[PDB]
Design a protein around this ligand. Structure first.
Ligand SMILES: [Cl-]
Ligand SMILES: [Cl-]
Ligand SMILES: [Cl-]
Lengths: 118, 117
């Protein structure tokens, strides 16, 4: 048995899936959830650097969302402590090779899921 | 299991992206130190992954042409020219928007790969 599917990317004890189609943050989260994953949680600078580089030119949703009145929360429930900057003031976070920013959640963007190694 | 620490697993191969720029030969030797070779590309999936993994900077991969011999992959498989290598040099590099060639003695980042079981 192996830690990740052959069509997922394994890095630093997490398996990643990068989508081939664009959908809303909520639909993407649902799609990750169908595969025992969440929209990507980023634990380290290593994880961030890998994610931004690979994302490339195109915006990709990741597992971070900010609701007015609540702290920033990762999709696995872990509170986010703002160790990286997120520009803009929209609820849903995306990244790409040159930015980590925010956009309206209903916008159709590519996405990235992750889950622990099996 | 999986690829080792600091390696990336995709399509039953483990990949490693360098943090320093070196000649193609020095790069191949560095890969060899870790049971790998400069990246070999078996499929369109591998190619698309490698170009994305490489990002914006040029990275050496395991394709090289000795001017009296055909093109050959670092794992011994002859290259069937399923993609074009532009430029005018012996050693192949790629990045997210390009596969081309450069003088082998030039210092570029590199990507290693190895199968895995
Ligand atoms: Cl998809
Ligand atoms: Cl290195
Ligand atoms: Cl360097």
């Amino acid at each position: 048995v192996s830690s990740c599917s052959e069509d997922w990317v394994g890095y630093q004890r997490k398996c990643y899936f990068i989508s081939t189609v664009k959908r809303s943050w909520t639909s993407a989260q649902n799609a990750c959830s169908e595969h025992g994953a969440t929209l990507a949680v980023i634990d380290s600078e290593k994880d961030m650097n890998f994610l931004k580089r690979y994302a490339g030119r195109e915006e990709h949703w990741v597992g971070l969302k900010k609701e007015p009145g609540h702290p920033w929360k990762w999709s696995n429930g872990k509170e986010f402590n703002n160790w990286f900057n997120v520009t803009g003031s929209d609820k849903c976070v995306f990244l790409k090779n040159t930015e980590v920013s925010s956009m309206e959640c209903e916008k159709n963007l590519y996405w990235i899921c992750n889950k622990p190694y099996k």
